[PDB]
Amino acid sequence: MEDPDQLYTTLKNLLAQIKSHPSAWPFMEPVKKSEAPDYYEVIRFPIDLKTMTERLRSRYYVTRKLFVADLQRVIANCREYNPPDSEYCRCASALEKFFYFKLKEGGLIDK
């Protein structure tokens, strides 16, 4: 981005699609402590799709890499905190596969 608008609309279109995928459900909002009470001690950079939407809209994502780092961390955080064949991790693999196909579709990583 010396074309910030192209980046913005590309990311917004990407994220709208990611949030539409059925495996995005566990990652739609920040982890509640009433469910995972040590989460925010164990996971020091928590990330979710609501926070990512707020970051997009406030122009946090000035590079594609900042967006991809946060998206990839939604998955890495899941795999660090949850059992590898838990439902949550099942979803994480499904959503990751889907967003890599999208990243590749949008020319955002190599195909």
Author numbering: 727 to 837
From the paper:
The 61 BRDs in the human genome cluster into eight families based on structure/sequence similarity. Despite large sequence variations, all BRD modules share a conserved fold that comprises a left-handed bundle of four α helices (αZ, αA, αB, αC), linked by loop regions of variable length (ZA and BC loops), which line the Kac binding site and determine binding specificity. The four helices form a deep cavity that is extended by the two loop regions (ZA and BC loops), creating a largely hydrophobic Kac binding pocket.
BRDs are evolutionarily conserved and present in diverse nuclear proteins comprising HATs (GCN5, PCAF), ATP-dependent chromatin-remodeling complexes (BAZ1B), helicases (SMARCA), methyltransferases (MLL, ASH1L), transcriptional coactivators (TRIM/TIF1, TAFs) transcriptional mediators (TAF1), nuclear-scaffolding proteins (PB1), and the BET family (Muller et al., 2011).
